[PDB]
Ligand binder design. Structure first.
Ligand SMILES: NC(=O)c1ccc[n+]([C@@H]2O[C@H](COP(=O)([O-])OP(=O)(O)OC[C@H]3O[C@@H](n4cnc5c(N)ncnc54)[C@H](O)[C@@H]3O)[C@@H](O)[C@H]2O)c1
Ligand SMILES: NC(=O)c1ccc[n+]([C@@H]2O[C@H](COP(=O)([O-])OP(=O)(O)OC[C@H]3O[C@@H](n4cnc5c(N)ncnc54)[C@H](O)[C@@H]3O)[C@@H](O)[C@H]2O)c1
Ligand SMILES: NC(=O)c1ccc[n+]([C@@H]2O[C@H](COP(=O)([O-])OP(=O)(O)OC[C@H]3O[C@@H](n4cnc5c(N)ncnc54)[C@H](O)[C@@H]3O)[C@@H](O)[C@H]2O)c1
Ligand SMILES: NC(=O)c1ccc[n+]([C@@H]2O[C@H](COP(=O)([O-])OP(=O)(O)OC[C@H]3O[C@@H](n4cnc5c(N)ncnc54)[C@H](O)[C@@H]3O)[C@@H](O)[C@H]2O)c1
Lengths: 334, 334, 334, 334
């Protein structure tokens, strides 16, 4: 029903597409990138990480035909010339990675879109939402440039929430051991981040993350209580959050895991998951939840310091959240 | 001067051999493995991780010849049959990974050697030593079967000592993001550990570690204060320790780095190193120190919770400490 | 229908099992390995290359329970002790990699089975079959210990048959650029083959292959005309054959491609596939045919020399052919 | 001596820089890229493939200081603006990958340079040289825009030359199994070549090559007699050429190998090398020759069809040849 347009048909853009084909509440009517339709059809069809799209994809002139519906292909470098309004696009998913500051993202609104979901942390957005955490704070009257935060924040927030509500976080530090992404380099090339300049598939690469601090945007009570870093490693998809926290109450592993399982089975079902199996990163490829607790890794010291580890498919989970947010937003009235 | 034999000419035995080539004090005279001298000479010459050996290597009958010196090659499955005594070996480096219980390692003693250094965490050993942390605790009379601990423990202990001595650790949790080793599987094969059963180069693999508890063996005051986990990733060598600790003194990032830098330049010179460069794991390939603080990653929260990151070449640094321990033991009279 | 047993529940053993679940002609009633039922169920459930099995898998005592069918699990190191006969097993799939000589393989018949399929090149076998090439040569009275040849030979033979029949092969050389397998080493360890002793995921590793020579076992006319080598590379599955042959007739790329395409659509349907897409190795992960021509790579020089490239999922395509041969053999009378 | 400028301080640019450090005949006075001196200094110091540069490297304002030598750093996207002439640069190495067409490369001549070496196959150049094959054909008066061809052509031409001279090539097909380069993509992104669009470290990726054909530029007699393809694989550096050729005379494997070895030790010493060790790609990291025959891989069928395999460090060997050519051109007078 709600008409969606995707700006930047890359890892997240094409994964959102894939997640959207499942949602009957949403309809992707157009995509914009920097290439032609033949190239997009080919990239959409064959995915190195996710396998063949199971849908008939063809090219009809300048457009994509997927299961008989035509999808408009644009190739406009400048968001202002998109003309979203002319084709009836209501919600734009901004997934280029170039327009995360309000000045650029709002161009879509000026082009006739009713709402914009930035697929990353933003600057000056109306509101930053983590589904299952603070979607209730969205005001349809006032919020038009919406950030869906990062994949890492989507992983950490749901369980930080649980731990905080339940035991109370004094302070905590995280490490995300993260698959490489298109922001890195194949072989030692210039980068703003000198760590991210280095061959992506050959090293463990420390890099900064704003994800722990960003939790404070969706869970105000944690402002100034978490910090963290990332470690980019030689895998193409799937990541994991390692959080070490000092709690207010004294707990046991059993207690910590019970609260997490409860939430995964209740309030956070479909967002937070819980696993007691000894799995590895490849096992989570294709996982649509935001966070899956590795129960076997939970660990406590002195009743107060806990280690919690949670898996996330950084392309899939995050893309399903983008679609969830689009439906929720549309559900509040456009 | 002191003659050394190496049992198990694998990643550690060959790395120990390379390090011993630069040591004035010890001389490797014989090796034992399960293969022929021709295979061993090939493996010693050409290393996938460390490149070509810059030495002249040849085979003379059943022996390896390295820079004119003849090295005896044995192929004895049973340590008891080694006959270390006849060829004068006083110190045996136990690097097979099969004889880590004192009872098994003591077979070299039966075979004529005077001291045994097990290249891993041991069972019932006379003493566990971490060079620069507790070598002073070694008694030449009382201790014959000595464990050099694990690579991770050698990384963590030298800086856990500084932090504790300086600020006081209340409690702390570690994660080692570690390169794969020969204990893993190429493609999903039975293993006691169901996580290590999985394709080593394809996933992020959580696995347990006793390295954080094992710090208690060399710094008794940390007994029951640390715990940790490991994450094996798709790189062939070089690992990193990520420690999150609750300190007793309120600190700044600058004071933590200054204490670390101070120890690296002083007391722990050769063992602890300190780096302010934004490096990646490949830059640590060949590093001989046990631990190199990544000073740029140091972070504090609420003045009490710290994050310290330290690099280690799990093959080279650990091998260099094996040689250091061997010469320290020799220095104390054998 | 025909009851089957699997000896060696590894990459081929488990992939045959997966293939067999959707074949109504055969039924796997028992497997043999060197491990417990819990480890095998785990490995059957979660695969690093092929993902999660879509079947319900559990452990019932000492056995596996798959989709409500109890599967007997054995842990006999000696085939002669398998007692295949007492539980009605007619065909045994020999996939341990240890029993490729007819005399070793024949222990299975001593144990009560009626037929043995060795999942690799054999020694002294009754017959070597390549489905699609010479299965008509199977004789139910004279052949009991059958070899299904190698994955490489199953890729090459079907298209070498078309080129030969249509144009006539004078001579030709093959290279298989192949994924790594459990026969290789994680980090430089002794191996009979000094090339396979080297870190599997770190290099391009030239290795010998008998596959081009083995085509003569299924296509007698090609004896002495083909030879080749292999290059093992850092990918966990999927391989490709590059054949260069001197032909009898003058051809064009179009002629050669049309010939391959006709065979793929007619006689070799299901065994030989034909692709006009510019795909990469990951796109063929899960592919069930033995051979898929990369039509874009077909090249001719001087009307006489041709280059043909064909893809193959070395685990899946091969495993499906084992299943096809088991079904074929059962149709001929047991 | 000859003052050299480098345009595009990338994999080839910095490897040429490394190679030049050793040449007393050539002096690198300036480099141009698109970033600052601090970034370039860091990239030159720390290399993911070749390790730490053994030289003192610092930044002196806006310049690089290497072992006392100041190296001017420019950052001009447009070659027209480099003003080579003003700083005395005689030879320019064009290694950005963007200016291979004569009209773009000639811009360096208009900016004051005397000669331009394009580090890639070119369009409309004055001449294409393969050191040790046709450098004798270079005319100082007439040739000012010179291509040093590709890394593959440099591997192939030296031994195709020997083979043709000795036995005579009728026709041949080559496959180059090649390390990934910065021309590829980390995770499926638009690319002009839909093969090269796919995740580089995840697959075996077939791609066209003009290297076989380009041999005819340097060995005119082979025009129309060779063709080939490439396969990009998950390794960061080092490649291998696989040539299958129909010969004019009848040879033995022993004859072919002795011809290659004779050339490697005579004519082509330092360009063509010969190895009888069973080595792997990582063993050739840092290899400065153009082509190293893998003698154990030589194979003959019917005395007429030959397979010759040759290794090449695509970064280092090519880079030393760029330095070789520069020194050659200089010696003929500027
Ligand atoms: N990859 C992940 O795991 C991930 C997860 C969550 C959020 N994100 C965020 O999503 C964003 C996209 O990341 P990605 O990994 O998908 O990147 P990407 O490189 O795969 O895709 C970006 C796409 O945008 C296109 N593009 C670039 N500039 C354009 C322009 N001006 N107009 C139109 N198209 C343009 C590119 O051609 C490409 O197709 C970034 O903000 C990233 O931080 C990424
Ligand atoms: N790789 C590392 O980073 C590392 C670091 C520190 C300590 N360690 C420990 O060192 C030990 C060896 O580790 P590795 O990685 O060098 O292993 P590895 O597999 O590469 O080497 C073991 C070697 O021992 C030989 N061997 C096996 N059984 C033998 C026997 N009975 N007699 C003689 N030789 C025998 C094998 O042929 C092989 O060469 C293990 O205890 C491991 O925990 C490993
Ligand atoms: N992986 C491939 O691409 C492939 C393709 C075609 C043919 N093959 C052939 O198939 C055979 C198996 O290859 P793989 O890749 O599956 O190997 P693998 O190493 O993955 O599996 C071997 C299995 O046999 C079990 N095993 C070993 N010795 C045993 C014994 N004595 N009794 C019972 N079980 C035993 C092991 O525990 C393991 O599960 C080899 O002959 C191989 O050449 C392999
Ligand atoms: N990598 C190899 O093995 C290899 C080998 C032989 C030849 N080559 C050829 O050499 C060239 C360079 O290849 P590479 O692998 O080094 O690539 P690269 O991507 O590593 O480096 C190119 C460098 O050029 C700089 N650059 C880009 N545009 C520029 C501009 N307009 N002005 C100045 N600098 C600019 C980039 O920042 C980068 O540092 C290509 O033509 C390639 O085909 C590459």
């Amino acid at each position: 029903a709600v008409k969606v347009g995707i700006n930047g048909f890359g890892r997240i853009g094409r994964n959102v597409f894939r997640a959207a084909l499942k949602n009957p509440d949403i309809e992707v009517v157009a995509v914009n990138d920097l290439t032609d339709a033949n190239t997009l059809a080919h990239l959409l069809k064959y995915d190195s990480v996710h396998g063949r799209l199971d849908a008939e994809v063809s090219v009809n002139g300048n457009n994509l035909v997927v299961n008989g519906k035509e999808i408009i292909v644009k190739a406009e470098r400048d968001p202002e010339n998109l003309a979203w309004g002319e084709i009836g696009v209501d919600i734009v998913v901004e997934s280029t990675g170039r327009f995360t500051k309000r000045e650029d993202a709002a161009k879509h609104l000026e082009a006739g879109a009713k709402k914009v979901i930035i697929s990353a942390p933003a600057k000056n957005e109306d509101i930053t939402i983590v589904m299952g955490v603070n979607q209730d704070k969205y005001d349809p009257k006032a919020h038009h440039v919406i950030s869906n935060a990062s994949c890492t924040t989507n992983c950490l927030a749901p369980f930080a929430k649980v731990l905080h509500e339940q035991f109370g976080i004094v302070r905590g530090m995280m490490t995300t051991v993260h698959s490489y992404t298109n922001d890195q380099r194949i072989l030692d090339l210039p980068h703003k981040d000198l760590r991210r300049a280095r061959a992506a598939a050959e090293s463990i690469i420390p890099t900064t993350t704003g994800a722990a601090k960003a939790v404070a945007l969706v869970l105000p009570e944690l402002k100034g209580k978490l910090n963290g870093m990332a470690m980019r490693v030689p895998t193409p998809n799937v990541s994991v959050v390692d959080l070490v926290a000092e709690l207010e109450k004294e707990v046991t592993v059993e207690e910590v895991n019970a609260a997490l399982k409860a939430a995964a089975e209740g309030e956070l079902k479909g967002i937070l998951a819980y696993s007691e199996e000894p799995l590895v990163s490849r096992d989570y490829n294709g996982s649509t939840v935001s966070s899956t607790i590795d129960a076997l890794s939970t660990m406590v010291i002195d009743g107060k310091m806990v280690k919690v580890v949670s898996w996330y498919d950084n392309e899939t989970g995050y893309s399903h959240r983008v679609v969830d947010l689009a439906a929720y937003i549309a559900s509040k009235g456009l």
